[PDB]
Short mmCIF file of C-alpha atoms and ligand atoms in Angstrom, two decimals:
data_model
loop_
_atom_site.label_atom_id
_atom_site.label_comp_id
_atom_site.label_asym_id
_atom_site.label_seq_id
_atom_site.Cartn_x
_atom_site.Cartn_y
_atom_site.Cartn_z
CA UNK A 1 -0.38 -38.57 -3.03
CA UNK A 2 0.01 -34.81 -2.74
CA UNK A 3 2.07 -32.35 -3.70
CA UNK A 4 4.51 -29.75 -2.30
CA UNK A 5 2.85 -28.25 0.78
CA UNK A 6 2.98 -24.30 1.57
CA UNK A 7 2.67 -23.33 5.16
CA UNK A 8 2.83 -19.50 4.69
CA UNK A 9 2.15 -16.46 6.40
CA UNK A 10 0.19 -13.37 6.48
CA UNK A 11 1.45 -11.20 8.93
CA UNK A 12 -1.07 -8.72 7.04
CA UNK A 13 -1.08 -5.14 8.40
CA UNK A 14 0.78 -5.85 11.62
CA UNK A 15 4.14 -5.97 13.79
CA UNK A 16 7.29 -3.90 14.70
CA UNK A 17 10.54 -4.21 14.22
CA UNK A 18 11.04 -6.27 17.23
CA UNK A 19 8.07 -8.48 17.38
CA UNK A 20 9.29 -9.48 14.01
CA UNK A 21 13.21 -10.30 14.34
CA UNK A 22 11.74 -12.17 17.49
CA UNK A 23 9.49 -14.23 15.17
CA UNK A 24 11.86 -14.71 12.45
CA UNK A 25 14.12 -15.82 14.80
CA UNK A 26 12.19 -18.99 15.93
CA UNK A 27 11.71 -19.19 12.36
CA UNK A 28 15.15 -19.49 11.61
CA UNK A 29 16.28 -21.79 14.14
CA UNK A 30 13.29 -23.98 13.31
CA UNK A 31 14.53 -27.32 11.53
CA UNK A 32 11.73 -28.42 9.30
CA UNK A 33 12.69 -31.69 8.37
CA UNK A 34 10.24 -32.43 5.36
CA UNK A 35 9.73 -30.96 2.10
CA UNK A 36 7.15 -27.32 2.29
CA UNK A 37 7.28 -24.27 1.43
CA UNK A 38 7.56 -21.55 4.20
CA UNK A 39 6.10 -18.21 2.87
CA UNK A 40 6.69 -15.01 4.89
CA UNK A 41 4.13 -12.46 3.49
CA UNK A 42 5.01 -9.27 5.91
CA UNK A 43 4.49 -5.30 5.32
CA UNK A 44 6.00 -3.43 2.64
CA UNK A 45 7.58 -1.47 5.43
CA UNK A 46 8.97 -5.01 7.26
CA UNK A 47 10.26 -6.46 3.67
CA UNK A 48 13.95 -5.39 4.04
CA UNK A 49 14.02 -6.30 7.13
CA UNK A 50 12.43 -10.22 6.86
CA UNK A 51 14.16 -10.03 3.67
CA UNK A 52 18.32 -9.00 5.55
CA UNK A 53 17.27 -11.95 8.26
CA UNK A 54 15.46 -14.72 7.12
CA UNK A 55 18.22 -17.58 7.00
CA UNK A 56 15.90 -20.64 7.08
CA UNK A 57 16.15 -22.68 3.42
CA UNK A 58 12.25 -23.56 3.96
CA UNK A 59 11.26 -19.69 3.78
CA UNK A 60 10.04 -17.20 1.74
CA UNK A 61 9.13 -13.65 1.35
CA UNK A 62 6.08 -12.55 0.11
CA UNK A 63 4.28 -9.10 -0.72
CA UNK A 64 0.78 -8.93 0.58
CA UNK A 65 -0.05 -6.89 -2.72
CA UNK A 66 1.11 -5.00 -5.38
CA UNK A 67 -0.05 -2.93 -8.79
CA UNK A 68 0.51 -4.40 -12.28
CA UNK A 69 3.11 -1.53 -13.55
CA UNK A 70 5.07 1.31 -11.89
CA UNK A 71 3.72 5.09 -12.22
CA UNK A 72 1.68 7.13 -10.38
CA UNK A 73 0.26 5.48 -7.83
CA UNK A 74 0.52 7.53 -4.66
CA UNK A 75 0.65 5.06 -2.50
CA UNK A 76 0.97 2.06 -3.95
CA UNK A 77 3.95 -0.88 -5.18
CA UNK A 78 4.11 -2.14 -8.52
CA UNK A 79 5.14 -5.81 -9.36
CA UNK A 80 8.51 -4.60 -11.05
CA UNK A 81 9.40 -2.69 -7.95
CA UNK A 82 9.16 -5.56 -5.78
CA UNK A 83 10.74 -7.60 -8.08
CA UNK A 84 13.99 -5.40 -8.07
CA UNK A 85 14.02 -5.36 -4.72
CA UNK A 86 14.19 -9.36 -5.05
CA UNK A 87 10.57 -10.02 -4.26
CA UNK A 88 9.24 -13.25 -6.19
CA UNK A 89 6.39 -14.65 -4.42
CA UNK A 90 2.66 -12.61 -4.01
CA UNK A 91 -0.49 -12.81 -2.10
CA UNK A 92 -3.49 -11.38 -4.55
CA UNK A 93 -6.67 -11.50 -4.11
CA UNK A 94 -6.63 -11.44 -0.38
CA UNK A 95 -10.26 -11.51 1.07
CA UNK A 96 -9.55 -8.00 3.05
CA UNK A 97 -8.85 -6.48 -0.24
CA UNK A 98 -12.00 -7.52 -2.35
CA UNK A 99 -14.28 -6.61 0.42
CA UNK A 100 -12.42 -3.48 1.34
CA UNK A 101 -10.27 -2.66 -1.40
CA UNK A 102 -12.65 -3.21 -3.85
CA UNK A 103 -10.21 -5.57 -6.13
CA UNK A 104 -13.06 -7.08 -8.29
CA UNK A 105 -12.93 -10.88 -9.99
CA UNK A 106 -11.25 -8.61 -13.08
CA UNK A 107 -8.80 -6.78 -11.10
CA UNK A 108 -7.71 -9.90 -9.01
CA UNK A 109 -7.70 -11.46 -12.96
CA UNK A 110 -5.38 -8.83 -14.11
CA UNK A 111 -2.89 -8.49 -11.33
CA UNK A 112 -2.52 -12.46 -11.28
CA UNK A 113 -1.69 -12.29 -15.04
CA UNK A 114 0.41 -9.47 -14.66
CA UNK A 115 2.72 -11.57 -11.58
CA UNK A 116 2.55 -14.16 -13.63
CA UNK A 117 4.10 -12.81 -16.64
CA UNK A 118 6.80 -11.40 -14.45
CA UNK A 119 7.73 -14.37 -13.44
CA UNK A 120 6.14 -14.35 -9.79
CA UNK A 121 5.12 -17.02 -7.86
CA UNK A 122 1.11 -16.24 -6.89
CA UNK A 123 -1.31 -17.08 -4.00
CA UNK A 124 -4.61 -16.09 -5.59
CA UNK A 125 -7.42 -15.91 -2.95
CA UNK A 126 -11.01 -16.83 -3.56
CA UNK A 127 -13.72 -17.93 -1.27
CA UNK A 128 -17.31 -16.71 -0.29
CA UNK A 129 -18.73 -14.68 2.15
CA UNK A 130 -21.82 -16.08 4.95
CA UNK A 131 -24.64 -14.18 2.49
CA UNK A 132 -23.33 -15.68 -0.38
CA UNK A 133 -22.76 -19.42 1.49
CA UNK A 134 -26.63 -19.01 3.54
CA UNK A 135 -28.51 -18.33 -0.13
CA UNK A 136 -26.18 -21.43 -1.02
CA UNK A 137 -24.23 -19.57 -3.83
CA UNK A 138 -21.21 -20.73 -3.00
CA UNK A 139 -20.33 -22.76 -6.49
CA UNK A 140 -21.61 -19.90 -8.15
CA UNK A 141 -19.64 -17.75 -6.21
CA UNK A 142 -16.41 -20.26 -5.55
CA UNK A 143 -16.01 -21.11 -9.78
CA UNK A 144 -16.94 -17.90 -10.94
CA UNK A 145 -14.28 -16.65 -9.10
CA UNK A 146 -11.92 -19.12 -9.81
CA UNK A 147 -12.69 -18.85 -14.03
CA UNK A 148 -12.18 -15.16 -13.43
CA UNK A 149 -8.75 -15.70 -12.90
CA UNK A 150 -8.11 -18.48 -15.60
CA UNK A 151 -9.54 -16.59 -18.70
CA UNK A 152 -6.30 -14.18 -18.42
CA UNK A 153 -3.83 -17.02 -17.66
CA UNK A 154 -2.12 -19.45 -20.47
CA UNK A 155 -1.62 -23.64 -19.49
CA UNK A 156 1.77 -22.95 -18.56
CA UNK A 157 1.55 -20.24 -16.32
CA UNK A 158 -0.72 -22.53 -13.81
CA UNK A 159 2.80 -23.36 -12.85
CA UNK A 160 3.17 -20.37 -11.25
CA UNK A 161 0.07 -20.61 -9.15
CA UNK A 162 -1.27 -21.17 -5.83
CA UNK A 163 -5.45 -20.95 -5.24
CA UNK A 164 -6.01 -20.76 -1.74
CA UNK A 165 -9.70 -21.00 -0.56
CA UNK A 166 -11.00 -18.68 1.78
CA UNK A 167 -13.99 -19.55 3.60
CA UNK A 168 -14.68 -15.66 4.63
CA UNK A 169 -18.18 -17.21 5.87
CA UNK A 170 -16.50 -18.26 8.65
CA UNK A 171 -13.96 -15.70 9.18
CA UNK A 172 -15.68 -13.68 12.08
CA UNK A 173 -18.79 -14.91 11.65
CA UNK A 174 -18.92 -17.01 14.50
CA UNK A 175 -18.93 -19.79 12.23
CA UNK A 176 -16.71 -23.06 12.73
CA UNK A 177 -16.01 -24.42 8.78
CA UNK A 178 -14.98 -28.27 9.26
CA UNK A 179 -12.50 -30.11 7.45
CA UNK A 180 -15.55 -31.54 6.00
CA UNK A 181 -16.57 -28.14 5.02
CA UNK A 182 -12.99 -27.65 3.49
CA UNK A 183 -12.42 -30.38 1.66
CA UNK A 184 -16.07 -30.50 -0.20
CA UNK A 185 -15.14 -26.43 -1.25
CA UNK A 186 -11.61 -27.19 -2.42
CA UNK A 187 -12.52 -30.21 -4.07
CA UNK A 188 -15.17 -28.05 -6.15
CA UNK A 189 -11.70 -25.98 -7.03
CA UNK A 190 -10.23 -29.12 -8.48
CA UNK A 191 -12.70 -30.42 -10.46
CA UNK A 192 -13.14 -27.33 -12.49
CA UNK A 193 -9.16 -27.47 -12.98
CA UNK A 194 -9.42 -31.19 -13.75
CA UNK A 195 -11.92 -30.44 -16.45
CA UNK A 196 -11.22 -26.61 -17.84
CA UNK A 197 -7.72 -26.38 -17.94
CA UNK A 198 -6.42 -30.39 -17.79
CA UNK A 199 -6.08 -33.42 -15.14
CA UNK A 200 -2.50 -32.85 -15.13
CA UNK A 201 -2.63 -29.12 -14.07
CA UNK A 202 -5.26 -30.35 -11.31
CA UNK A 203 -3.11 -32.88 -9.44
CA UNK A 204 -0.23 -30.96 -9.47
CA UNK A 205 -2.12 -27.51 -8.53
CA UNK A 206 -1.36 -26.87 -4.36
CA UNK A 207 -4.38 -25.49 -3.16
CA UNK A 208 -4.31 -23.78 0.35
CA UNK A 209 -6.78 -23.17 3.76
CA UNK A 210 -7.80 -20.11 4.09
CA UNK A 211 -10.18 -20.10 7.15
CA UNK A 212 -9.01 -19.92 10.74
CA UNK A 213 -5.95 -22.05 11.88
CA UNK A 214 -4.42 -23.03 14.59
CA UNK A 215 -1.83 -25.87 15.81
CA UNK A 216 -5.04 -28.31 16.95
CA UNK A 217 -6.95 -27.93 14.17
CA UNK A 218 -4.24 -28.05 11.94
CA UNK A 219 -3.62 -31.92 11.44
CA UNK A 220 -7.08 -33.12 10.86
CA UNK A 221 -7.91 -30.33 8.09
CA UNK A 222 -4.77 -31.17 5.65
CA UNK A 223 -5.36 -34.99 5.70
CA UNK A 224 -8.03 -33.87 3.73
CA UNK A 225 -7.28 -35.11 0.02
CA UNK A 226 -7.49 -31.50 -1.24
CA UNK A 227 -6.30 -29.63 1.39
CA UNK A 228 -2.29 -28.71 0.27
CA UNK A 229 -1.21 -26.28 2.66
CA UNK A 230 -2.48 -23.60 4.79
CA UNK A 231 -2.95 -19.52 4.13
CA UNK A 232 -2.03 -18.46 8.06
CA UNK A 233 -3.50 -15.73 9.57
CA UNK A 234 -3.41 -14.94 13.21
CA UNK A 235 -1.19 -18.05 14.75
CA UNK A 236 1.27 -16.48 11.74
CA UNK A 237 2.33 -13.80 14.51
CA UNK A 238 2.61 -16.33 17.02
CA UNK A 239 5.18 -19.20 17.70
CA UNK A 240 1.86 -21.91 16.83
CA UNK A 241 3.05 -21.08 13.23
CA UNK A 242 5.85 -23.73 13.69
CA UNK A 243 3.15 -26.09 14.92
CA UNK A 244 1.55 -25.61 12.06
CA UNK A 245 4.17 -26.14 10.20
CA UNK A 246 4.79 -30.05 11.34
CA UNK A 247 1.32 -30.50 10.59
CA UNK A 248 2.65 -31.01 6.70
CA UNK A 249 2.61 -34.22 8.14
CA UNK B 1 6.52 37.93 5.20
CA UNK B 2 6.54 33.77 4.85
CA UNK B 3 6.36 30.85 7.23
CA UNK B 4 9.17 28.22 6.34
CA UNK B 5 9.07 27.05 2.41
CA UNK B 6 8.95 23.13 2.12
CA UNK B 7 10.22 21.33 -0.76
CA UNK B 8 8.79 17.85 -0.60
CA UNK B 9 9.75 15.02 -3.47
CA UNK B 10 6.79 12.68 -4.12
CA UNK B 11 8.37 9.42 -6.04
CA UNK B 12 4.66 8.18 -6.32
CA UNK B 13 4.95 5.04 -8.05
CA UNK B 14 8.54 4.67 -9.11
CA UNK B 15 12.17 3.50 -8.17
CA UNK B 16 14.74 1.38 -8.27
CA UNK B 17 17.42 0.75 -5.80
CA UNK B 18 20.08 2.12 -8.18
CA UNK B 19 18.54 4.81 -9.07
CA UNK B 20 17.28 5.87 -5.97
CA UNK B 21 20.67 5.59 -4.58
CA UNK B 22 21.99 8.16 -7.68
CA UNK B 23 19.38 10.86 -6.35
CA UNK B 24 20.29 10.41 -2.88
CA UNK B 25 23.71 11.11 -3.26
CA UNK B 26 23.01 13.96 -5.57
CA UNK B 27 20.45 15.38 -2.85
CA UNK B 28 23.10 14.68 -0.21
CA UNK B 29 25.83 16.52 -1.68
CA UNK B 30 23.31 19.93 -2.36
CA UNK B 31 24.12 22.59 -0.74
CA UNK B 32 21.06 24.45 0.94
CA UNK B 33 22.19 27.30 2.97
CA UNK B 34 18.19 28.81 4.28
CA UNK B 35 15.58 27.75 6.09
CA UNK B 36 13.88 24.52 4.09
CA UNK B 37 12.25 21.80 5.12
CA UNK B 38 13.06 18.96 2.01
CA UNK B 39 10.85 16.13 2.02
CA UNK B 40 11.43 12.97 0.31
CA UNK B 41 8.22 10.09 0.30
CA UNK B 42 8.95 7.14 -1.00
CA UNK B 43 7.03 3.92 -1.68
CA UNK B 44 6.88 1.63 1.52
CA UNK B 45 9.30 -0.57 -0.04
CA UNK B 46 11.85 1.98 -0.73
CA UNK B 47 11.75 3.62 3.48
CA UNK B 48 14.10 1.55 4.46
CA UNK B 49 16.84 2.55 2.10
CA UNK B 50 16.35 5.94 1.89
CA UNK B 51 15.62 6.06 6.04
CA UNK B 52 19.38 4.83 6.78
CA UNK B 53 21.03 6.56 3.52
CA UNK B 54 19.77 10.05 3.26
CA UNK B 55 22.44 11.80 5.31
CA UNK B 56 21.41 15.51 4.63
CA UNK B 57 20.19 17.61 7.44
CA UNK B 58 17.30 19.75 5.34
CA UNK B 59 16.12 16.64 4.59
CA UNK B 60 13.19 14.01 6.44
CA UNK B 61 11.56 10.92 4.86
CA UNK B 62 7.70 10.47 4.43
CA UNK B 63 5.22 7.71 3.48
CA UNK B 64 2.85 8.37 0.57
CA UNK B 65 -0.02 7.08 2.75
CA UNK B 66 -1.13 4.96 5.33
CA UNK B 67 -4.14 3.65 7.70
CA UNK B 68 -4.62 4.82 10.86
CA UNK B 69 -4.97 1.49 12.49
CA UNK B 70 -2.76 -2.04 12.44
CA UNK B 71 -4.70 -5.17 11.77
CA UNK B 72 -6.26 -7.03 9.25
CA UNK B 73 -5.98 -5.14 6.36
CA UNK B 74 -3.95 -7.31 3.66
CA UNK B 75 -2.04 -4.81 1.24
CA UNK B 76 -1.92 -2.40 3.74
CA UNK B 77 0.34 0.23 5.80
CA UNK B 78 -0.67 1.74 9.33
CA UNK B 79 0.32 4.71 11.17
CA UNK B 80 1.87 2.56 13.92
CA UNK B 81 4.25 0.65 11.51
CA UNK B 82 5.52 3.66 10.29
CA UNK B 83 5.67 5.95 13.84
CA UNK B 84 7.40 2.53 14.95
CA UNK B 85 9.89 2.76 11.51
CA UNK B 86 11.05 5.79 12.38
CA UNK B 87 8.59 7.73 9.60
CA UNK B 88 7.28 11.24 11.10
CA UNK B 89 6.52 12.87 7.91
CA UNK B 90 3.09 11.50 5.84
CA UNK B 91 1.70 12.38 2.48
CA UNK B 92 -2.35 12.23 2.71
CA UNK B 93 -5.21 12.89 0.68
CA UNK B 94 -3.45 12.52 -2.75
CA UNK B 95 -5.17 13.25 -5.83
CA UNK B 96 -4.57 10.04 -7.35
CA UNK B 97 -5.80 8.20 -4.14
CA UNK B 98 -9.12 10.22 -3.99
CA UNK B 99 -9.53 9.09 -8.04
CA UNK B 100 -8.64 5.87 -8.14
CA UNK B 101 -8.56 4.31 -4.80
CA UNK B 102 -11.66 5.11 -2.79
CA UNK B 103 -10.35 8.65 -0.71
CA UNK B 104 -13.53 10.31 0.31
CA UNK B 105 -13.32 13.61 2.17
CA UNK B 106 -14.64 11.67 5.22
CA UNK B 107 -11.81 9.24 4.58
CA UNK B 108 -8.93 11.75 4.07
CA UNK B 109 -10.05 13.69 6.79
CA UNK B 110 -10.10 10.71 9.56
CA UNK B 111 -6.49 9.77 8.40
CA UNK B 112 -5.46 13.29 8.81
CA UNK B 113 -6.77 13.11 12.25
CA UNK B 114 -5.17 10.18 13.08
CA UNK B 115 -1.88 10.54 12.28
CA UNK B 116 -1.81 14.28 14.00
CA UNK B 117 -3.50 12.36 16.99
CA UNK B 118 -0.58 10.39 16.34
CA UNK B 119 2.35 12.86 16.16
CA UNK B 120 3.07 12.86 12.59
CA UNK B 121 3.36 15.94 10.14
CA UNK B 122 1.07 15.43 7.52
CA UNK B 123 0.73 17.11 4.10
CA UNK B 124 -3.05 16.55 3.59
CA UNK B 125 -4.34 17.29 -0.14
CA UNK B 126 -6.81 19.02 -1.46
CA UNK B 127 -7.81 20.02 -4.81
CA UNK B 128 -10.51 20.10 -7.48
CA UNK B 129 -11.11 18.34 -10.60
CA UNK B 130 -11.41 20.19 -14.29
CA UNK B 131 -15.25 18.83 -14.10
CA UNK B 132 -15.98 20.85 -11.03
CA UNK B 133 -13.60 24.07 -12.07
CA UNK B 134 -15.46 24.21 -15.45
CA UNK B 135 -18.77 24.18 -13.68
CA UNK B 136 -17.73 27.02 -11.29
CA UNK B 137 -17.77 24.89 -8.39
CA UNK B 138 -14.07 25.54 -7.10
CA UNK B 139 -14.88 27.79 -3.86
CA UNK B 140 -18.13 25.15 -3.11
CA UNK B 141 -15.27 22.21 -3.56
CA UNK B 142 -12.27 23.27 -2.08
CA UNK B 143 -13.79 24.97 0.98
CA UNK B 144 -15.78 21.83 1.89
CA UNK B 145 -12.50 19.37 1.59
CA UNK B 146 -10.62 21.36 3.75
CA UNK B 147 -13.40 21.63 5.76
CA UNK B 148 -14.20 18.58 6.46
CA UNK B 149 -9.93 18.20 7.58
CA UNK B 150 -10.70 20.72 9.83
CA UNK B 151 -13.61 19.15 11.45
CA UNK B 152 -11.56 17.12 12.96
CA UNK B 153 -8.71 19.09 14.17
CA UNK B 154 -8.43 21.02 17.25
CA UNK B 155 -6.50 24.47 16.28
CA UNK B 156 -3.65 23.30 18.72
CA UNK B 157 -3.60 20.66 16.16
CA UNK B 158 -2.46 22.85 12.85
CA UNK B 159 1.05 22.95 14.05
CA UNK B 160 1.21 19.68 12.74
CA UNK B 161 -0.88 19.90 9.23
CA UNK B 162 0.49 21.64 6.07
CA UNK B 163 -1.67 21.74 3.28
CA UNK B 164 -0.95 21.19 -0.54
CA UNK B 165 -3.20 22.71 -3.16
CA UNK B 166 -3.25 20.01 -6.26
CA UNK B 167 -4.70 21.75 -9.21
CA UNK B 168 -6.89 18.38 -10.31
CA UNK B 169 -8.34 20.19 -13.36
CA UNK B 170 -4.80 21.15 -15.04
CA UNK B 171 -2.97 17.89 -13.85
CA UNK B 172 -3.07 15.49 -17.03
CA UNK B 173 -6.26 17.14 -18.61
CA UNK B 174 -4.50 19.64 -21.74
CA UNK B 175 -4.60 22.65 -19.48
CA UNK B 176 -2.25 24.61 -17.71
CA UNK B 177 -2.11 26.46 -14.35
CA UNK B 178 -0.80 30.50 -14.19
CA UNK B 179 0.47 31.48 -10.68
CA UNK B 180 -2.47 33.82 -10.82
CA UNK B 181 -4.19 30.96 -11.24
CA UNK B 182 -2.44 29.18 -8.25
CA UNK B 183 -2.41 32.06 -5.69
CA UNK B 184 -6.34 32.27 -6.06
CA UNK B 185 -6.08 28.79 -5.08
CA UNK B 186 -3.74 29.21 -2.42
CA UNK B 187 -5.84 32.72 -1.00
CA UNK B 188 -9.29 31.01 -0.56
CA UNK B 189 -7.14 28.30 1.80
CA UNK B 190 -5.58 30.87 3.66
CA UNK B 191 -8.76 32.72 3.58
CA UNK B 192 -10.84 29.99 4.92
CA UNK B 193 -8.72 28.85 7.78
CA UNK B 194 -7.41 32.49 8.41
CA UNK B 195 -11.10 33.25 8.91
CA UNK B 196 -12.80 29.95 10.36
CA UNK B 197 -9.43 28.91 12.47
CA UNK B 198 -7.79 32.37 13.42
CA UNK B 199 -5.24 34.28 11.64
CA UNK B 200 -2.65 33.27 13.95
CA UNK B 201 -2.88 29.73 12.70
CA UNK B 202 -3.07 30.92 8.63
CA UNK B 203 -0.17 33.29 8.33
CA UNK B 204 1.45 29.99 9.80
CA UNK B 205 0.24 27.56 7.36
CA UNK B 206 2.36 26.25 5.08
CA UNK B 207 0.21 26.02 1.49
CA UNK B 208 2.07 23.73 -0.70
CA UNK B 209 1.11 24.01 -4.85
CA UNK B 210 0.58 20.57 -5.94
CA UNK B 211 0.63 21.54 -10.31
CA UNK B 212 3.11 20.71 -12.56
CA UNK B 213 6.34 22.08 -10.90
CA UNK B 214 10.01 22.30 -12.75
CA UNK B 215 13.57 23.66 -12.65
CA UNK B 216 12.07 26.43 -15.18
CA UNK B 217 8.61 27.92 -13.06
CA UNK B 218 9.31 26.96 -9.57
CA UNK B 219 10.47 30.86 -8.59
CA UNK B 220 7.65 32.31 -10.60
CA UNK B 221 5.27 30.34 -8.89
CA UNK B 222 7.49 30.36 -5.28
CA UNK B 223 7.29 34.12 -5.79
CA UNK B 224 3.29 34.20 -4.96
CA UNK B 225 2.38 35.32 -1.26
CA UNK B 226 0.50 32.00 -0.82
CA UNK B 227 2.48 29.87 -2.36
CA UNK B 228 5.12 27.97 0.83
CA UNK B 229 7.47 25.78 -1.40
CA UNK B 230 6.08 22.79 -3.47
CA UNK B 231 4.36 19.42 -3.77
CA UNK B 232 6.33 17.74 -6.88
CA UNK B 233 5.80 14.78 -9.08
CA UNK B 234 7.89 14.34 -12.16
CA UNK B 235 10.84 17.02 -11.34
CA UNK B 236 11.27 14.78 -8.29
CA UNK B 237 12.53 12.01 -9.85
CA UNK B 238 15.18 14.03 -11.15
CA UNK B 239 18.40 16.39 -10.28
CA UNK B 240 15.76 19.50 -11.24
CA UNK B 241 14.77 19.03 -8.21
CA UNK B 242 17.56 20.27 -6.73
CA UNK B 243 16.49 24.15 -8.45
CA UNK B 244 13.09 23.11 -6.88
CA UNK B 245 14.83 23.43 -3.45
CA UNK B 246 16.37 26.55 -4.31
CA UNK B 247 13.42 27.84 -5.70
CA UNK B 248 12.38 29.02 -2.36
CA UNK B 249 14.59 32.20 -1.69
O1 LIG C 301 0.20 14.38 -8.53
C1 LIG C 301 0.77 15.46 -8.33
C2 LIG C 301 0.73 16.52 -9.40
C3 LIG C 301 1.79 16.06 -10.39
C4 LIG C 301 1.89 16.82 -11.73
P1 LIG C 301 3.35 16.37 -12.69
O2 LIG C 301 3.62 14.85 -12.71
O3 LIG C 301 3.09 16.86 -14.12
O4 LIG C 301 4.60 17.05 -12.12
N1 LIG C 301 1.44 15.77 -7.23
O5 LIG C 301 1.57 14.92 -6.13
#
């Protein structure tokens, strides 16, 4: 078998007021009959508001980022800010912040640990980009990554953690990754948890889809054996999201 | 003799609910009787509770950055969000932000643009650092970041830009800043834009002093011809704050 599915959401840097209570309305009055996770990741701006409406039992809220500890940080929302304001669940690592952000494998590494010990419940992102995949660096790339993150974290705090594998070589590349694709990259994943860290870790570790989906494609990719859930872009700001959902199957 | 003072609280990284909520209430119940414009920017989480509980009228909310386009961009805050949330006042070009987070002067500038283009009030930042200062390079560094603002403005445009000089070099480094010191600071900006813009703009400019500001040397420093109220870190934080605001005549 598998284990507990996430469906979640990454509204990223997007919406208003509206478009949002619209969405979360749909949301709400969704019944999801199986057992998944629904994560709302939404703007720092949005958070109250998600946060004041969000009924469903299947959801949750989650920051798209955050800063190890509060200080001076013009601009920027540290993990025991968010958790005051009730926030347990995080999205680091996000592809959009490495390659614009520049949130290096040691940065990533050192928020993670830091949500971790705060008791947060983590997304980590990893994945590499079409250079990196075309000069077939990928497991290079892909476990180095992945390590990265480990070094900093203890064998109970995998617990905590969610990996969820971005295949940025197809995200707007023109570039169609196939559950194929998926599956042979998040299987990688597992075997290095299977072996570094322990067999029981592995199995029970969730590990997510980060490339492109949508309610078609949605199905086929999470019958893959490694596949445990999805990291939704796009069709997250659409009504599709609730397809996607059911496809949790 | 002076354009309108401003008194603007920057919480940086920091907050809680609870004691946000304390502040509030204390800068609600102040008593301001002239002509101040109080600004309080809080961290994107923190908007929404000080947006609908701030009831003073000297008082507006502002967000302690943003991008100037919505999108993918995981982490982060656009101008649209915020014009949609209801925030009109912007804090841009921070000191912190051009040292730790990637702010280059072509960057800070294109924001600036952006959110004038946009409709917002912006209090862009500018400043140099105790490497440049040492090596006599403040006139070559300070003209050139407020240039490069400026390049992108249209003069119509400066009714919407007030400008904070951050003494980089005496912030955190074991030095300290005299209001001499400060008013040089202040006189090159008001020079520069008085000369290259057109004095009707600069006596109109509103030059903010970005230093180390407290309940003990805000009228010394309030009392220097270019010096138009404050841009406040610590002092903010706390009920000082409130002398800040008075601080101004
Ligand atoms: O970053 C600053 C200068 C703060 C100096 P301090 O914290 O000593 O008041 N303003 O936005």
């Amino acid at each position: 078998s598998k284990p507990q599915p996430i469906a979640a959401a990454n509204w990223k840097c997007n919406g208003s007021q509206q478009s949002l209570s619209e969405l979360i309305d749909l949301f709400n009055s969704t019944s999801i009959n199986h057992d998944v996770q629904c994560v709302v990741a939404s703007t720092f701006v949005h958070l109250a508001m998600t946060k004041e409406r969000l009924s469903h039992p299947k959801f949750v809220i989650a920051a798209q980022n955050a800063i190890a500890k509060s200080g001076a940080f013009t601009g920027e929302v540290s993990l025991p800010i968010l958790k005051d304001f009730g926030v347990n669940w995080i999205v680091l690592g996000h592809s959009e912040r490495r390659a614009y952000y520049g949130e290096t494998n040691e940065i990533v590494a050192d928020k993670v640990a830091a949500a971790v010990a705060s008791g947060f419940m983590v997304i980590a992102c990893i994945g590499e980009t079409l250079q990196e995949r075309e000069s077939g660096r990928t497991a290079v790339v892909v476990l180095t990554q992945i390590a990265a993150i480990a070094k900093k974290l203890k064998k109970a705090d995998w617990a905590k953690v969610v990996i969820a594998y971005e295949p940025v070589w197809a995200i707007g590349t023109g570039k169609v990754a196939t559950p194929q694709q998926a599956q042979e990259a998040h299987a990688l994943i597992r075997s290095w948890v299977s072996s570094k860290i322990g067999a029981d870790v592995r199995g029970e570790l969730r590990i997510l889809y980060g490339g492109s989906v949508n309610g078609k494609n949605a199905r086929t990719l999470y019958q893959q054996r490694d596949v445990n859930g999805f990291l939704v872009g796009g069709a997250s700001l659409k009504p599709e999201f609730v397809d996607i959902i059911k496809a949790t199957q």
